[PDB]
Write an enzyme that holds these catalytic residues in place. Structure first.
Site, mmCIF file in Angstrom:
data_model
loop_
_atom_site.group_PDB
_atom_site.id
_atom_site.type_symbol
_atom_site.label_atom_id
_atom_site.label_comp_id
_atom_site.label_asym_id
_atom_site.label_seq_id
_atom_site.Cartn_x
_atom_site.Cartn_y
_atom_site.Cartn_z
ATOM 1 N N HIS A 487 0.826 -1.203 0.000
ATOM 2 C CA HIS A 487 0.000 0.000 0.000
ATOM 3 C C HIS A 487 0.867 1.261 0.000
ATOM 4 C CE1 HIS A 487 -3.355 2.457 2.176
ATOM 5 N NE2 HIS A 487 -2.270 3.210 2.199
ATOM 6 N N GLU A 488 1.823 1.350 0.933
ATOM 7 C CA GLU A 488 2.703 2.523 0.973
ATOM 8 C C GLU A 488 3.487 2.676 -0.321
ATOM 9 O OE1 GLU A 488 2.833 5.043 3.143
ATOM 10 O OE2 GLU A 488 1.004 4.061 3.848
ATOM 11 N N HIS A 491 2.161 4.861 -3.142
ATOM 12 C CA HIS A 491 2.226 6.311 -3.048
ATOM 13 C C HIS A 491 3.418 6.910 -3.777
ATOM 14 C CE1 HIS A 491 -1.252 6.407 -0.765
ATOM 15 N NE2 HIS A 491 -0.739 6.071 0.399
ATOM 16 N N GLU A 548 -6.558 6.416 -0.290
ATOM 17 C CA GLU A 548 -6.284 5.271 0.575
ATOM 18 C C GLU A 548 -6.907 3.972 0.058
ATOM 19 O OE1 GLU A 548 -4.056 5.382 3.555
ATOM 20 O OE2 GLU A 548 -3.617 6.684 1.871
ATOM 21 N N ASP A 552 -4.865 0.526 -0.810
ATOM 22 C CA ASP A 552 -5.100 -0.807 -0.231
ATOM 23 C C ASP A 552 -5.285 -1.833 -1.328
ATOM 24 O OD1 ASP A 552 -4.900 -0.153 2.420
ATOM 25 O OD2 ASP A 552 -7.100 -0.109 2.763
HETATM 26 ZN ZN LIG Z 1 -1.730 5.384 2.232
#
Ligand SMILES: [Zn+2]
Ligand SMILES: [Zn+2]
Length: 650
Positions: A487-488, A491, A548, A552
């Site tokens: 997930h990170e 970004h 977000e 995910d």
């Molecule tokens: Zn995030």
């Protein structure tokens, strides 16, 4: 390895295809009722609590025996025990600050302030203004020395300026506090009154020149690059060559973040007589030392900053304040002994390999995107492989040899520790940015990808159950921490990450086609979440949580793909009756286990850019083909959505 998931967390009366979150986490909910002081409590909160007890037990254990002089254990143990030796603190009284107060009294020329203010900075005081060294926001590969508005004991300008009766009370409490503190340092009452008035006059003038905290948060607008000699013309009453030499800073340019407060410092130095400046510097020394001396002085400090300013009713016990000192001023040294006890090299090596497998799986998925052009795919893969991966604890630890801890006084040790930290920060002014230096300590329970540096940082503190269990198998760890890290990772490449190149510099590297097609794919997700009822008659905000929910989704597809690659060609064994693929999704759900009050559901829906724990599970898995296969989810399942309606963005 261990299955990782636990039967106590499940609610097996739920149907996985009806409410998977309830299936995987309903037992956790039942077994962790809210106490009353919390509106939300999940497995992240449980870990944070567990982690603070780990540090407490660790530091006490270190302090309970003598260690070889010069080791980090000796520095930690001795600092803790000298912080706790209240008989000595109370017998010493104010005497540890006498060298500073005597030194301030010898000031006899306003020109000496240029060196003197730098000397105070090295000991952790910031009279008049602050300085710091960090990555240049205009040139992320280089450091820049910045000044910042400062010099206020109360921190916020409004306390000095607002005329309502509530703020006037705080001001007059501060005036009384300053007089009482001077008197505790042996200043006679008539002199304590006069010196308090100097302090208030000077800090009130500084406060008038400050900007509101709202205006100072933008680092691109709070930036004025100029040469040292140009600052010398802007603020002529400080010799900046001497000030910088006393800081051991050799630079050609710097940034004045806010020029008007600096011009006010120039005027204050010109207009205030030197005796009033000495009052202010003496106050800065006393106010900084107030936590590190006798109980009487601490109690008076707390009476103002704790009871008046913060609304606290009781001070923390000394042991908690001693542990804070150790953890806050020897942070990375504590980190060494923390990971020696809790996060061995084999755990770091497993997690570093896992992150590299996630990177390889993500690169594979980037090659198959249908919204990114070929040139953008190449730029993305190059940026991804250039990630600075900071996992568990540093490859390059701070060298603590020059920081001496010894049994002279609590205050003298705090001073040496701050001098060590300030020297380490200021030394960076001459050097290019070093991305192997950690900004977080290993014991911290936080983790993120940083778009402005292209680094991903997951400290040992967060790499614990239910996110990572060194004793658990790959199904558990990929499903839990693996999804969180993936997930990170997204970004670096989503609507936020596309504004930064691989060095963390501002550059928009998406084409117009990339941008249009990304939003086309993203709309599938925002529409889907729009239609979720998080409560009867209350819908999720699909556009507000989109950053977000897309991430995910990406973490799920990235980690699942890496997981299947990692276990390729190995024997599947069911555990607790679950296949490895089923455990992956049960471990994922457990990362978001949580209890939340009804009113807290409503407010987070208004304010929180993250989806709620439950819909991070129940709104994401219907978009993951592998979840349908793992749990036999069919067209007849309430959570089922048709293949052609599922998100395809990663
Ligand atoms: Zn995030
Ligand atoms: Zn496995």
């Amino acid at each position: 390895d261990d299955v990782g998931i636990r039967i106590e967390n499940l609610d097996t009366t739920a149907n996985p295809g009806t409410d998977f979150y309830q299936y995987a986490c309903g037992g956790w909910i039942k077994n962790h009722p809210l106490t009353g002081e919390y509106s939300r409590f999940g497995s992240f909160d449980k870990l944070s609590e567990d982690n603070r007890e780990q540090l407490k037990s660790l530091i006490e254990e270190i302090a309970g025996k003598e260690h070889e002089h010069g080791t980090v254990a000796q520095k930690i143990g001795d600092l803790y025990n000298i912080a706790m030796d209240s008989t000595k603190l109370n017998a010493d009284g104010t005497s540890p600050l006498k060298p500073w107060l005597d030194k301030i009294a010898t000031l006899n020329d306003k020109a000496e302030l240029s060196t003197f203010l730098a000397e105070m900075k090295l000991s952790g005081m910031s009279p008049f203004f602050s300085v710091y060294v960090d990555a240049d926001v205009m040139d992320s590969k280089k450091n820049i020395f910045s000044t910042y508005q400062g010099g206020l004991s109360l921190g916020q300008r409004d306390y000095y300026l607002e005329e309502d009766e509530s703020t006037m009370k705080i001001r007059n409490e501060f005036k009384n506090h300053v007089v009482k503190m001077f008197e505790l340092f042996g200043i006679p009452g008539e002199q304590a009154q006069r010196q308090m008035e100097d302090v208030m006059r000077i800090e009130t003038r500084l406060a008038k020149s400050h900007f509101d905290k709202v205006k100072t948060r933008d680092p691109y607008a709070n930036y004025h690059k100029m040469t040292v000699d140009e600052l010398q013309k802007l603020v002529p009453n400080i010799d900046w060559t001497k000030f910088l030499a006393a800081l051991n800073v050799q630079i050609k340019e710097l940034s004045v973040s806010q020029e008007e407060p600096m011009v006010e410092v120039n005027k204050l130095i010109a207009e205030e007589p030197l005796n009033a400046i000495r009052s202010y510097l003496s106050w800065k020394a006393i106010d900084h030392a107030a936590s590190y001396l006798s109980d009487e002085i601490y109690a008076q400090n707390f009476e103002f900053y704790g009871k008046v300013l913060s609304g606290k009713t009781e001070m923390q016990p000394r042991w908690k304040r001693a542990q804070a000192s150790v953890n806050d001023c020897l942070g990375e040294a504590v980190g060494q002994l923390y990971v020696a006890k809790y996060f061995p090299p084999e755990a770091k090596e497993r997690m570093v390999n896992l992150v590299h497998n996630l990177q390889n799986a993500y690169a594979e998925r980037i090659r198959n995107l249908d919204w990114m052009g070929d040139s953008t795919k190449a730029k993305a893969i190059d940026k991804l492989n250039a990630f600075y991966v900071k996992i568990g604890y540093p490859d390059k630890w701070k060298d603590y040899t020059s920081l001496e801890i010894k049994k002279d006084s609590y205050f003298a040790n705090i001073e040496r520790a701050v001098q060590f930290a300030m020297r380490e920060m200021l030394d960076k002014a001459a050097k290019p940015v070093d991305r192997d230096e950690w900004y977080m300590t290993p014991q911290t329970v936080n983790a993120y990808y940083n778009p402005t540096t292209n680094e991903i940082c997951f400290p040992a503190g967060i790499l614990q159950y239910p996110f990572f269990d060194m004793n658990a198998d790959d199904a558990f760890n990929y499903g839990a921490i693996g999804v969180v890290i993936g997930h990170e990772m997204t970004h670096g490449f989503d609507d936020q990450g596309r504004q930064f190149d691989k060095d963390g510099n501002l550059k928009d590297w998406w084409t117009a086609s990339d941008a249009e097609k990304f939003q086309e794919r993203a709309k599938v997700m925002s529409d889907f979440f729009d239609n979720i009822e998080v409560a009867p008659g209350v819908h999720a905000n699909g556009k507000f949580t989109l950053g977000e929910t897309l991430a995910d989704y990406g973490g799920l597809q990235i980690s699942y793909q890496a997981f299947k690659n990692a276990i390729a060609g190995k024997t599947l064994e069911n555990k607790l009756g679950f296949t490895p693929d089923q455990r992956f999704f049960l471990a994922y759900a457990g990362v978001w286990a949580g209890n939340i009050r009804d009113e807290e559901i409503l407010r987070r829906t208004k304010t929180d850019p993250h989806a709620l724990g439950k819909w991070r599970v129940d709104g994401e898995l219907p978009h993951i083909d592998a979840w349908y296969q793992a749990f036999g989810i069919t067209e007849n399942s309430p959570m089922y959505i048709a293949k052609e309606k599922r998100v395809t963005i990663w």
